[PDB]
Every structure is written in C-alpha cells, then in structure tokens.
Design a protein around this ligand. Structure first.
Ligand code: NA
Ligand code: NA
Ligand code: NA
Ligand code: NA
Ligand code: NA
Ligand code: NA
Ligand code: NA
Ligand code: NA
Lengths: 146, 144, 144, 146
C-alpha cells in the first residue's frame, strides 16, 4: 500500500487536460467566471460547459479555491445551499456538508434568518448570502487525458 | 488502490494509431488490402506490430465481433508450416489445448497444404498460405 | 514486483519538453528571461505548468544544484501576499513547519513589502513581488 | 500480487523500441544476421551493435528463437559454449546451462570429443559444432523506450 498510493497518484496526474482558461488541480479543472450571476444561474451556467458549481470534497481543495478567489478579490458562489431554509446545508451533488467543514464559515456564519441560503467565498472564509445576489462563480469538472 | 491504479493506467494508455481499434490494452489493425500469409507477416512487422497472436478468450470474441461487420477472412499469426499438425503462433508459442475449441467445424486439416490460419466471424479455418486475404495486426496501445 | 513496476514506470514516463530538465517524475523549466512574480505565475500557466511548488527535500536539493551552475535568483510558487507572515504555495497549501529550514539566513521578513519568495543557490529569500527575476516552472513528466 | 504481474508486464511492454531490421520479443530486440561467421567473430560482431550473442533465459524465448531460425532454414550460433572442452556448457554472460535446458539438444547432443564446443540451432533442436564453422548468428539486446 506504501507505493500504491504514490504510483496511483503519479499516474492519475498524467491526465491533466483542461479547457482554455481553466486551471488544473488534483485531477480536476476549475473555471473562474468573468461575469457575475445569481446562484441558480451559476448552477446552470456551469452545466452548459459540462461542469458543476464547485463541490468541495477535501481541505486541500478548499485551500486551493480560497486562494484563487482571494487572488482576484472576488466573492464567488460554490455549489452549497440550504434551500429548505432550515440549517441543513447540502452540496449540489446531493452530499451533505460534513461536520469537519463547518470550520470554514466566517464568524457568525451561517444564519437561520434573512433568507440567505447560498454559500459564497467571502474574504478568508465562507459566508451565506441571498441567492439572488450577483457573484462570480467557480465551475469544476474532471480533468481529461486528451 | 491496486485496481484504481489500473483504471488510471487503462484510462491513460489507450492511444492507437489512426485507423486501428483499441481493445483491452492493445491496438488492432484490420487491413485495407489482401496478401498471402508471409507478406501479411512482414506487413505487420513494417508497422512495429505482429500478425495477431490471440492470448485471451475476450480478444478472440472481440475479433469475431469486429470481423462480423464485414464477414471478412483474415490471416492471423498462427501456422503449421512444418506440417506436423503442430500449430504455433508467430511469437513461437504453441496453440494451447484450451484454444483448440476456436477452430471452425471441420478445421484444421492434416492434408491439402493448408498450413496457415485465417480468422472468420465464427472461428478459425486453416488454408493455403499463398491465398490472398486481409490481415490483422496487433501491438500495445500507447499512453500519448 | 511492486518496485519493479515503478522502475518500468520511472523508465517509460520521463519525457520532458525541449529545454526542460527531468527529475524524479517531473519536468522543470529554468526561464530564459525575467519577469515579476505575478507575470511569472501566468507564464507557467501558459505552458500548462505551475510556478514551482516544492514538495520534497530532494527536489529542493536538485533545484539548488541546478541554480548553482548560474547563481540565478528565481521566483518560486510561494508567497505571503496578504502580509500575515503566512506563506502559501500557489496550489493553496501552507508552508509546512519542516520546510521553514530552507529560508536563507535572515529570511523571511515581516516588513518591506517583500511578499514573494525567490529561489537561490543556498535557499529562499523573500523579496518585492515587482522585482524582475528568472522563474522556475514545474509539471509532470510524460510517457511519450 | 495478482494484478502486479499483469500491470508490471503491461507496462514493460510499452518500451519496445528496436533498431531497423531487429525483431521485438518480451522486452528484448533480436537481430538475425545476413552473413555467416565463426562463433568467436559472431560474439564480437554482436558487441559492435551494442548487443550479445543470444543468451536464452526462458523456454518461451527458446521457442521464439527456434521458430525464427527455422523460418529461414538457417543454422544459427547462440551464446553457449564449452571451451574448457569438458562437458561444462556456459552462456557468454557467465551463467551455466541449467539442467532444465538439456532437453533442447538434438538426440545424441552434446558430444565429449570431436572439438565441437559451440552451440547452434540445428533443425528443431540444438547441436554442438566446431567453433570455426561459418553460421548465421542471432544478437540480443534490451529494448529501449525511445
Ligand atoms: Na442562511
Ligand atoms: Na450572511
Ligand atoms: Na492443415
Ligand atoms: Na481448411
Ligand atoms: Na516578507
Ligand atoms: Na528579503
Ligand atoms: Na562438444
Ligand atoms: Na555436433
């Protein structure tokens, strides 16, 4: 198992093809929008380019993403929301926000009232915001070998 | 992770030359012209490949499916040139006992100077090595 | 056979673009011109690579040997742009505690707007991000 | 170990580069001469092209080689000899002829007398012959990745 991890990784890293203007990171391609849209229109905007409003699965991915948005100083949408409006945050892929990720919300975040059910990268952490607000968005999709 | 590694490998290394078909790690070339068995052998060597040597039942099945869309007869890397009823692949290996099942009904033959194998949609036939047939070349798929 | 597999892998996948140097699975590009830190970052992205992020002690050593033949100063994918004394690689990862040893004596600094790291023959120095330096790009070696 | 063997093999098979006119087989390149020379001159002739008078290491290699020489109906030298003239056959790489390979000699082969201390592929098996005789020869060298 010692080598398997290394080799497996070294191998998966060879398939790193991403579209033009997209950035590669650990097996996936990321797209930083050039315009702004509300949450819902961002969810569909990503599907149009065969991607998905970014669903964060590891702490390393979260670090990469936060660095990207802060580099351009833009507030960006992520595929996380609580549309049932009851403290249950879920990723657009259907998975639930794991306990170990609550650490990423900025102090005071999230909030039960105010009709703010969409997560965004805001400053050095996460903020919940009105889904109708206009923000940049980040798309994510598997990297290809060709 | 062992299996996941193969998936990565299987995913990355599946590059085949233009007009060759990929299948389980290899590239297969169905010719666009016919030649006798010996010239088919050199034809494959010229493209750094080998007149197809069948190693698995799946490959045999795949080649049958490919062949079925045209109903061709193709030379394969199998022969009994010394006429001993001793069939060998061009890589020197003997036709194992478990692969003898692939001969079509009535094949092979210990008579008629039919010392070469041809691949059809239902199995193998033995035939005169000088006959003109299409051929099938085989070589490993690449990674880039 | 595990190790023997790597040897095969290590042997086959060591292809690097023209003018890049291969080292333990990766390709390194020592620039032929200078730019500021941000333009160096985009310069690497333009060639499907990344301003070098150092992951092992061996790589650090290798880059020092490479650098020593010219005594250059090169931008590396490390910065503290928010000026927190919090250094991060361009892939988002924090400078681990065990890699802090590579800073040259007297580096880094919590003053002087020197928020970018430059690679020298003896270690790292922090410097104004607008200064013009050569740069080092990194990306995986290929198999063909 | 089950997969390791498959994968390892599938991988080694990707480095199959051989010179012009040389034939590839299981990780190595083989050259069938176009002229004839005695044994000793064949040993050096192969070194000139960065190879070695073929040293057979497996039964599968032996089958491949025997098929090659019989295809052209040529008697060919191999890197096997008993120059000490005392029933001790050794490969040019210094390794000894293993017990399980004695099966390849043609009936009656080898012989203690007659000054025949060099092995050749003769017919469907091996023959020992006078080293000064002219035969075709087969060179062998590792296959490259480039
Ligand atoms: Na909320
Ligand atoms: Na909020
Ligand atoms: Na026959
Ligand atoms: Na027949
Ligand atoms: Na500083
Ligand atoms: Na400094
Ligand atoms: Na003898
Ligand atoms: Na003899």
């Amino acid at each position: 198992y010692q080598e398997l991890t290394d080799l497996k990784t070294a191998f998966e890293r060879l398939c790193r093809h991403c579209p033009k203007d997209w950035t590669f990171f650990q097996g996936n391609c990321y797209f930083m929008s050039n315009s702004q849209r509300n949450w819902h229109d961002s969810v569909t905007a990503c599907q149009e380019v065969r991607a998905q409003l970014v669903v964060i699965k590891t702490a390393e991915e979260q670090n990469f993403l936060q660095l990207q948005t802060s580099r351009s100083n833009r507030f960006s949408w992520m595929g996380l929301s609580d549309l049932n409006q009851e403290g249950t945050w879920q990723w657009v892929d259907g998975s639930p926000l794991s306990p170990s990720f609550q650490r990423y919300w900025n102090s005071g975040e999230p909030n039960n009232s105010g009709n703010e059910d969409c997560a965004e990268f805001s400053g050095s952490g996460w903020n919940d915001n009105r889904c109708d607000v206009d923000n940049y968005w980040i798309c994510k999709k598997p990297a290809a070998c060709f």
